[PDB]
Each structure stands twice: as structure tokens, then as C-alpha cells.
Amino acid sequence: TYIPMSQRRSWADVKPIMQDDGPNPVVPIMYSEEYKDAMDYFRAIAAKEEKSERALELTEIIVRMNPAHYTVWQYRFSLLTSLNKSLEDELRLMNEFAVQNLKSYQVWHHRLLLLDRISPQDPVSEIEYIHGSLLPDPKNYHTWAYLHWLYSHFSTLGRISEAQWGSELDWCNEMLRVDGRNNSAWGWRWYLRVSRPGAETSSRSLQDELIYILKSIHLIPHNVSAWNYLRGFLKHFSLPLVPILPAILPYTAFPMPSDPLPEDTPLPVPLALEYLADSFIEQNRVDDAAKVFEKLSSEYDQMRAGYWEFRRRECA
Amino acid sequence: ATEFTPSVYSLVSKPLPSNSRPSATLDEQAETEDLISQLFDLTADPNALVSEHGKRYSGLRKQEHTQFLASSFFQLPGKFVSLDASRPWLVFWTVHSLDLLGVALDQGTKDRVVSTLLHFLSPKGGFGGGPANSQIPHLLPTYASVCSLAIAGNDSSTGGWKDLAAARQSIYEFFMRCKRPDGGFVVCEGGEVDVRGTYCLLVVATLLDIITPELLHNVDKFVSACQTYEGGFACASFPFPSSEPSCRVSMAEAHGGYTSCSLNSHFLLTSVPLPSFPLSIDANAALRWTVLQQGEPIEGGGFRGRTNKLVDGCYSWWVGGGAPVAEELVRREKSRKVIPPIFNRVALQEFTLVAAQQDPGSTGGLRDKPGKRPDQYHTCNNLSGLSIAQHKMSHSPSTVSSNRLKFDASKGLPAVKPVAPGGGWKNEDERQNARREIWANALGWIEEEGGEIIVGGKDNRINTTTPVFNILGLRLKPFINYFYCQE
Numbered sequence: 001t002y003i004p005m006s007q008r009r010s011w012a013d014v015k016p017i018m019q020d021d022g023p024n025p026v027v028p029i030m031y032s033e034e035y036k037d038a039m040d041y042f043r044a045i046a047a048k049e050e051k052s053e054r055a056l057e058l059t060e061i062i063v064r065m066n067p068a069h070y071t072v073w074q075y076r077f078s079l080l081t082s083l084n085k086s087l088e089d090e091l092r093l094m095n096e097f098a099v100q101n102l103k104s105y106q107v108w109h110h111r112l113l114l115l116d117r118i119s120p121q122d123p124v125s126e127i128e129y130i131h132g133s134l135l136p137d138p139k140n141y142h143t144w145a146y147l148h149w150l151y152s153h154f155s156t157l158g159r160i161s162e163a164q165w166g167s168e169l170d171w172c173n174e175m176l177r178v179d180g181r182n183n184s185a186w187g188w189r190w191y192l193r194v195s196r197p198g199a200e201t202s203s204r205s206l207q208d209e210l211i212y213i214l215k216s217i218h219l220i221p222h223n224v225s226a227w228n229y230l231r232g233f234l235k236h237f238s239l240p241l242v243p244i245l246p247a248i249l250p251y252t253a254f255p256m257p258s259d260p261l262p263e264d265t266p267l268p269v270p271l272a273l274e275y276l277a278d279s280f281i282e283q284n285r286v287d288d289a290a291k292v293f294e295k296l297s298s299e300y301d302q303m304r305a306g307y308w309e310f311r312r313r314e315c316a
Numbered sequence: 317a318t319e320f321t322p323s324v325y326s327l328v329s330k331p332l333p334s335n336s337r338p339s340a341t342l343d344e345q346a347e348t349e350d351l352i353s354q355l356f357d358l359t360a361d362p363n364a365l366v367s368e369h370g371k372r373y374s375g376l377r378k379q380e381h382t383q384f385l386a387s388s389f390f391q392l393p394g395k396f397v398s399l400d401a402s403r404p405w406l407v408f409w410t411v412h413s414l415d416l417l418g419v420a421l422d423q424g425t426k427d428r429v430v431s432t433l434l435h436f437l438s439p440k441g442g443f444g445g446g447p448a449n450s451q452i453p454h455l456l457p458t459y460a461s462v463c464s465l466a467i468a469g470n471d472s473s474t475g476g477w478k479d480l481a482a483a484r485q486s487i488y489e490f491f492m493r494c495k496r497p498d499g500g501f502v503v504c505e506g507g508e509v510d511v512r513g514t515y516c517l518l519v520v521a522t523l524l525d526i527i528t529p530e531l532l533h534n535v536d537k538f539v540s541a542c543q544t545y546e547g548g549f550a551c552a553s554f555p556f557p558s559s560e561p562s563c564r565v566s567m568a569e570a571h572g573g574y575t576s577c578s579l580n581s582h583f584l585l586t587s588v589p590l591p592s593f594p595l596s597i598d599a600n601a602a603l604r605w606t607v608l609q610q611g612e613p614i615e616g617g618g619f620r621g622r623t624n625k626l627v628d629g630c631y632s633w634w635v636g637g638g639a640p641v642a643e644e645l646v647r648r649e650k651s652r653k654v655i656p657p658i659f660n661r662v663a664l665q666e667f668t669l670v671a672a673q674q675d676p677g678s679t680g681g682l683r684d685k686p687g688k689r690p691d692q693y694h695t696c697n698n699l700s701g702l703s704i705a706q707h708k709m710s711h712s713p714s715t716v717s718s719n720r721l722k723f724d725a726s727k728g729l730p731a732v733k734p735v736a737p738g739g740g741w742k743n744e745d746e747r748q749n750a751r752r753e754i755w756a757n758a759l760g761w762i763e764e765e766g767g768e769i770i771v772g773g774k775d776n777r778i779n780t781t782t783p784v785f786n787i788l789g790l791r792l793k794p795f796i797n798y799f800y801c802q803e
């Protein structure tokens with residue numbers, strides 16, 4: 001049975017403060033007794049700006065019932081820093097919140113603030129935790145964004161070694177091996193290989209990257225993630241489309257496609273036709289490009305009939 | 317008007333091919349294809365003259381959806397305490413949906429909406445997700461509260477608009493406390509930084525006449541660096557140092573929700589007459605990314621939120637509603653170097669009517685996909701996207717010109733006092749030119765004569781929302797006119 005906080009010895013000095021909604025608010029929520037009681041006492045705690053262990057315990061009670069309560073998370077972090085609490089202990093509590101499926105923008109941001117303030121000399125333990133946490137949801141958007149932030153922040157401090165970057169690409173390659181359609185992992189590859197400030201840009205690296213992209217397309221010809229990475233790659237580095245056309249042309253009917261294509265690969269592949277059309281434009285052959293856009297519009301990608309007609313009209 | 321918007325029932329439905337390479341992504345995709353295509357198979361084609369016998373009728377069940385929303389003006393069960401910090405969003409989702417559905421609130425209920433929201437307004441600036449004695453201000457409830465007051469308030473002494481006007485300086489000061497040197501904003505004290513905050517802040521600052529140069533510095537650069545190699549936008553960009561970063565890098569994958577916020581933010585900044593501002597985006601790439609997210613006929617022509625994930629009705633607003641913005645930016649660039657619909661306006665309505673409505677005779681409401689319960693958020697965003705598909709929206713240069721011609725720069729509320737001494741406009745000529753451009757462009761969206769497409773007949777028609785703002789034009793115009801003292 002629940003024991004109200006008014007009957008708790010540790011809280012006898014505190015006068016709770018009711019929620020000030022007005023007399024007849026719209027969108028009211030039918031709160032449980034436990035949640036209203038805790039918020040009644042949080043309002044009093046926050047009003048007197050009390051920084052204490054009982055206030056800390058009260059914030060944990062509240063965010064367990066509502067992990068999206070940004071105000072109580074903000075108060076919790078100021079309690080931790082004001083009381084000089086162990087931030088490694090708090091990080092272990094956050095590990096449990098994930099286990100028990102307590103999650104929100106607010107929890108992820110709490111974890112980031114902890115890592116920022118701890119400021120470890122080597123963040124490898126947090127990197128490995130993030131990697132493991134992605135196995136229930138390998139496309140969790142908050143998690144991927146947090147991983148980007150962690151490497152960006154600690155590389156700015158000079159704390160990501162060449163060995164660490166190398167094993168991060170190894171891990172990324174394994175994610176894409178297990179599911180080549182994971183667009184989140186393709187985004188991470190782009191950070192590791194192209195966008196991060198420390199990336200190498202050489203004749204060798206451009207050759208390697210192109211090899212990996214084309215192999216990926218030949219493994220899964222209908223994978224939109226691989227086509228988009230190819231187009232972004234060529235565009236980012238101002239590389240011509242035409243010299244690569246031999247690897248693409250078999251899908252319109254360096255690594256080359258399998259002599260018999262994989263089964264369950266109906267032709268043509270619409271984004272292969274987009275490649276061909278754009279390569280025609282690169283050759284200034286607008287009429288040939290227009291004919292490809294017309295076929296995309298009327299037969300091969302009809303959901304986008306209007307967009308492909310727009311593209312056709314630009315050329316004619 | 318439909319030569320290039322083929323109906324989903326007129327196209328061959330086929331699964332995404334496997335290439336003999338199974339994966340978890342494909343398992344989920346194929347299962348969702350089966351769910352959506354079977355519901356379409358059970359439903360009469362909305363484009364038929366006489367509805368088929370034995371099959372479900374797809375007409376928009378507006379009265380069911382009204383009854384679904386009516387809970388808000390009574391109460392919500394306890395299991396939605398997870399939204400206790402988002403009560404202004406519960407208001408907005410409800411009252412904007414009712415506007416779209418053409419259902420009026422009586423004045424007593426509108427006054428309850430106004431009064432509730434004003435209890436969320438903190439004297440030091442901004443709205444929280446609940447009572448000001450319980451929650452600190454936050455950029456996202458501030459957008460939801462301001463837009464809700466546009467929908468439910470008025471210019472009288474009990475209408476809430478005069479309280480907003482009196483709060484302009486404090487709201488501005490909250491916005492400036494949120495600002496980072498690199499051009500991002502935290503959403504609240506100690507909160508996260510992403511383009512949802514930028515979007516919500518720029519909408520409110522545009523509407524309330526509180527934009528200054530110090531508020532906007534680097535905001536364009538933060539947003540532009542969110543664009544990814546796929547052409548959409550991520551949640552945020554990271555500034556590598558040495559206010560003057562050496563470079564900025566996007567922090568996650570292109571996503572429908574952040575692409576909407578980024579396109580809308582950038583569009584609002586193009587109104588501001590600052591030198592070499594806003595930094596450009598790749599509009600062609602953004603338009604390409606947008607149209608590529610509309611699903612195949614087997615998945616009902618709804619939008620997905622990112623590559624190789626599942627279609628979901630709420631992206632009808634986030635991605636569909638970004639299309640007119642991307643289109644206008646492309647049009648500007650095409651001209652600056654000197655028409656068929658850009659997405660399948662018919663298929664998107666079919667997804668809304670056939671897949672996104674709750675099954676008939678039930679709770680009502682609209683949802684993510686079949687098999688998911690409807691909620692207020694998917695109700696609002698399905699209907700907002702349906703509106704964009706039904707009505708051809710464009711930003712009209714001649715309308716903007718006419719707006720400039722009628723603007724009265726001698727009328728207005730007190731200028732905001734900047735935080736830093738040099739943070740304001742240089743002089744009145746420049747401030748008034750800024751007010752004129754920002755007001756005149758905010759009122760530049762039109763529905764094109766003869767561009768209407770109402771799949772299934774005119775009883776399915778809903779009202780016309782505005783791109784960027786997502787409130788009805790009949791709400792936007794008197795609201796923004798109030799704060800700029802125009803009439």
C-alpha cells in the first residue's frame with residue numbers, strides 16, 4: 001500500500017504546492033496518486049530551491065514514472081553538480097533506465113551532459129556501451145546522433161586515437177554486413193570516411209571507397225541506401241559519372257555485377273536509370289536524358305511520374 | 317490535373333525485391349507491405365463512381381474523428397502521463413485538427429483554451445509544457461501555445477493575444493538565453509540543441525515581430541550544415557572550432573521531421589534582409605530526397621521518414637508538407653540562373669483515406685499505419701498532410717508584392733530592446749524594411765486556382781493549411797496582423 005508523503009517523517013517540514021492549472025483546464029490528465037503526490041512535493045522543493053539528497057531521490061521517483069519530464073531532468077542535473085555527486089554512479093543508473101525501457105530525448109541528453117562533465121580521458125567504454133545498446137533497435141535515431149556527438153566532441157579534445165577510428169570502421173562494416181539496408185550505418189560510414197575533419201582524402205582512399213560502394217550495389221541492386229551513397233559520393237568529390245557507367249549499365253536493361261544477376265532482381269533498377277539520365281546530361285546529350293526521364297515517368301517509376309516529367313521538361 | 321498522379325489502384329503492386337539477400341529491414345518491409353496492401357484490397361477504390369458491394373467505404377469519417385478529439389475537452393486517461401510535459405501539443409493537435417475538419421468551438425470552450433495556455437506562460441519568458449509553477453519554458457511548447465492561441469484566441473481583453481503582445485520582450489529574452497554562438501539554440505535551460513528548436517523559435521519570432529540581427533547570427537549556417545549527402549536534413553550540425561568554427565558536420569541521417577524543420581527554418585530566413593544571408597542550401601537535392609520518400613503502390617503511397625524504414629501517416633505532413641517549400645526554393649534558383657505536381661497528390665490521399673483512418677465504427681482518429689492505435693499527433697499530422705495533397709500551395713511573388721504595397725511601417729508594437737548594445741537593426745529605415753519583408757513573405761502562400769484535387773468526392777475536402785506555419789490562412793492573417801498592427 002502507498003504511504004503518502006504527508007505521513008513520511010523525512011518530509012514533515014515541507015508544505016506541498018498544488019499544480020496551478022486554473023479552475024477548469026483543457027487537456028487534463030488523470031494522474032495516479034503517486035505521481036500527483038510526488039509532483040506536489042517537487043513543486044515545493046523547486047520553489048525553495050532545495051538542493052538535497054531527498055530532492056535527488058524525489059527526481060528519480062518522478063522520471064521513473066515520466067521519463068519525458070524535462071523540467072525534473074534539468075533539476076536532477078543541477079542537484080548532481082551542486083552536490084558533487086558521483087557522475088559515474090549516475091551513468092550506471094542511466095544504463096538501467098535503458099534496460100527497463102525508460103527513454104526519451106531527455107534521458108539521452110542527460111547522458112550527454114554526464115559525459116561532457118565527466119570529460120573522460122578515454123571514452124572507449126562509452127563507445128562500446130553505445131554499440132551494445134544498438135542491438136535492440138539498430139536504427140535508433142537518438143543513439144546514432146549521440147554516437148556522432150561523442151566522436152565529434154572527444155575528437156575536438158584530441159582524445160580519439162587512430163586505432164580507435166580504425167576499429168570504429170571495422171564495427172561499421174560489420175553492421176552493414178549484418179544488414180546492408182541499415183541506412184543509419186551508411187550515414188555513420190559517411191562520417192567516418194568523408195565528413196569528419198580528420199578523414200583522409202587521397203587517390204587511394206577514393207579508389208577504395210568507390211570499390212566498397214560498387215560491391216555493395218552488386219550485392220543488393222535494389223538497395224536505395226547504396227545508390228544514394230554513390231550519388232552523394234560522386235557529387236561531393238566532383239567525380240564524373242561516365243567512367244563508372246560500365247558497372248551501372250547492366251541494371252538499366254572496378255567491381256562489375258555478377259554474370260547472372262542475383263535472383264529476385266527485376267530490371268530495370270529505377271535509380272540506375274536516374275544514373276544513366278544524369279550521365280547523359282554530363283555528356284550534354286539532353287535529348288537522350290529526356291528520353292530516360294520520360295520512361296521513368298510513364299513506365300518504370302510511376303509513383304514519381306510528376307517529378308520525372310519535371311526532370312524531362314528541364315531537358316527539352 | 318491528374319495525368320501525372322496515378323491512383324494506387326491503377327498501378328501494379330509488387331513487393332520490394334530481395335535480390336536473394338534477406339535482412340531484418342526487409343523482413344519488416346515485406347510484413348508492412350502485406351498489412352497495407354491487404355487493407356487496400358478490402359477497400360473500394362475511392363475514385364469509383366458507385367462504390368463496390370461487399371467492400372469497405374473509404375470516405376473521410378469526419379464525425380468519428382471529431383468525437384475522437386473530444387476527449388481533450390474533458391480528460392485523458394492516466395497512462396498518458398508520458399505527455400504531461402507536452403500538454404500544449406495536445407491542445408494544438410486538437411484545435412488545429414478541428415480547424416481542418418471544419419468544426420467550430422464555442423466561445424466558452426475557446427476561453428478555457430486561452431486561459432489554460434496563459435497559465436503555462438512564465439513571466440520571465442516563454443511557455444512550458446504545463447503550468448508555470450511546475451515546468452520551465454521550452455521552445456517547442458512555446459510554438460504549440462502560440463499557434464493554439466492563433467487558433468482559439470482573439471483581440472479582446474480575454475482573448476490572450478494582448479497577453480502575448482505584453483510578453484514580447486520577455487519571450488525575446490528567453491530566445492536569446494537559448495542561443496548558442498554557433499547558431500544553434502537549446503530548447504530549454506540545459507536542454508538539447510536541434511533544428512526542432514530553431515523551427516519553433518523562428519515561427520514564433522516571425523509572428524510576434526521580435527526578430528533582430530543578434531537573434532539570427534549564424535542560425536542560417538547551423539541549419540545549412542544539417543543537410544546530408546542524401547539531400548534531406550539531420551537533427552543538428554557540430555561546429556569544429558578554429559561563433560567562427562572551422563567547419564560544421566551533420567550529426568545523423570536525413571529525416572522527414574528534421575527536413576521539414578530545416579526547410580521551414582531556411583524559408584523563414586530568406587525573408588530577412590541581411591547581407592549574404594541566409595547561407596544557401598542544396599534545394600535540388602532536398603527536392604529529390606523529398607519525392608524519393610513517397611512509398612510504392614503496395615505500401616499505399618504514404619511517406620516514409622527515412623531511407624529503408626517504413627511508411628507512416630504522420631510524414632504526410634513532415635515530408636509532404638515540405639514539398640511546396642523545396643519546390644519554391646528550386647524555382648528561385650532556376651530563375652536566379654537566368655507544371656505537373658511534384659509528388660503523387662492522389663496516392664497520398666488514398667493512403668490517408670484507406671490506411672490511416674481508424675477502422676469504422678470504432679474510436680475514430682487517424683494513425684501511423686494499420687495495426688497501430690490512433691492518437692492526437694497522428695490525427696493532426698495525417699490531416700495536415702491530407703490538406704497539402706488536396707490543395708496546390710505555392711508561394712506567390714505577385715502576392716508578396718501586393719503585401720509590400722499595403723504594409724504600413726508607421727504602425728507597430730514597441731521595438732524589442734536587444735541584449736547586446738549593437739544587437740539591433742542599424743536604424744529605422746532598416747528595421748522597418750525588415751518588418752515589411754518578413755510580414756509580406758509570411759503572408760505569401762496561396763492556394764492555386766483550379767489546382768484542387770479531392771480524391772473520393774467533395775465531402776472528403778478539408779480546409780487549407782499554410783506551409784511553414786501549419787495553421788489555416790484564416791488564422792494566420794489576423795494573428796500576424798495583430799502583432800504588426802496591420803489591418
Ligand SMILES: CCCC[C@H]1CN(c2cccc(OC(F)(F)F)c2)C(=O)CN1Cc1cncn1Cc1ccc(Cl)cc1
Pocket residue numbers: 402405573628630684691692693
Ligand atoms: C501518442 C504520442 C505520439 C508519439 C510520437 C510523437 N512525439 C512527440 C511528442 C511530443 C511532442 C511532439 O512534437 C511534434 F511536433 F509533434 F513532433 C512529438 C514523440 O515524442 C514520439 N513519437 C513517436 C512517433 C510516431 N510517429 C513517429 N514518431 C517518431 C517521432 C516523431 C516526433 C518526434 Cl518529436 C519524435 C519522434
Ligand SMILES: CC(C)=CCC/C(C)=C/CC/C(C)=C/COP(=O)(O)OP(=O)(O)O
Pocket residue numbers: 139140141142456512515516571572573574577621622625626628634
Ligand atoms: C517541430 C517538431 C517537434 C518537429 C519534429 C518532427 C519529427 C517527426 C521529429 C522526429 C524525430 C525522430 C528522431 C524520429 C525517429 O523516430 P522513430 O524511429 O520512432 O520513427 P521512424 O522509424 O519513422 O524514423
Ligand SMILES: O=S(=O)(O)C[C@H](O)CNC1CCCCC1
Pocket residue numbers: 376377378379380381
Ligand atoms: O464520421 S462519419 O462516419 O461520417 C459519421 C458516423 O458514421 C455516423 N453514422 C451514421 C449516423 C447517422 C445514422 C446512421 C449512422
Ligand SMILES: O=S(=O)(O)C[C@H](O)CNC1CCCCC1
Pocket residue numbers: 043046047071438439440441448449450451452
Ligand atoms: O518566471 S519566474 O516566475 O521568475 C520562474 C518560473 O516562473 C518558476 N517556475 C518554476 C518551474 C519549475 C518548478 C518550480 C517553479
Ligand SMILES: O=S(=O)(O)C[C@H](O)CNC1CCCCC1
Pocket residue numbers: 375772773774775776
Ligand atoms: O460533390 S461530389 O464530389 O460531386 C459527390 C459527393 O461529395 C459524394 N459524397 C458522398 C455522398 C453520399 C454519402 C457519402 C459521401
Ligand SMILES: [Zn+2]
Pocket residue numbers: 628629630631684694
Ligand atoms: Zn508517425
